Amino acid sequence: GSSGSSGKRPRTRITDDQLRVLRQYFDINNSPSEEQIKEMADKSGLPQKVIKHWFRNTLFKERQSGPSSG
């Protein structure tokens, strides 16, 4: 190939069964509340740092504003 494989994120990794839990809430409320971040952290098993960040890294993206051509 060219390099081999992209490796930035830590060993940990979120699954479709866990992400879905973070996505579903996305609709209801952009970002989870100190209360939701906890209730979820247990529902899925992810920490409060992973969930919070995810919402950001993801949300921030949606906030992006690109021009239209075509």
Side-chain angles (χ1 to χ4, degrees):
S2 275
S3 52
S5 60
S6 55
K8 285 87 80 80
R9 292 206 283 275
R11 273 194 72 192
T12 51
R13 208 172 172 185
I14 306 163
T15 186
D16 307 320
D17 307 87
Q18 282 206 124
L19 180 70
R20 59 170 271 288
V21 176
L22 322 171
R23 281 276 298 192
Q24 293 271 9
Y25 281 64
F26 202 59
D27 204 273
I28 292 90
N29 170 1
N30 321 143
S31 311
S33 150
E34 298 188 311
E35 282 283 299
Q36 298 274 266
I37 309 185
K38 203 83 175 72
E39 90 173 10
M40 281 180 276
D42 203 294
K43 281 174 202 281
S44 80
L46 296 151
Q48 286 202 323
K49 62 189 77 72
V50 163
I51 300 160
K52 280 179 89 185
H53 157 105
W54 177 97
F55 270 95
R56 172 75 153 275
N57 187 44
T58 307
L59 172 80
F60 209 103
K61 299 271 283 300
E62 281 286 306
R63 299 296 204 82
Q64 82 171 68
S65 174
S68 186
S69 71

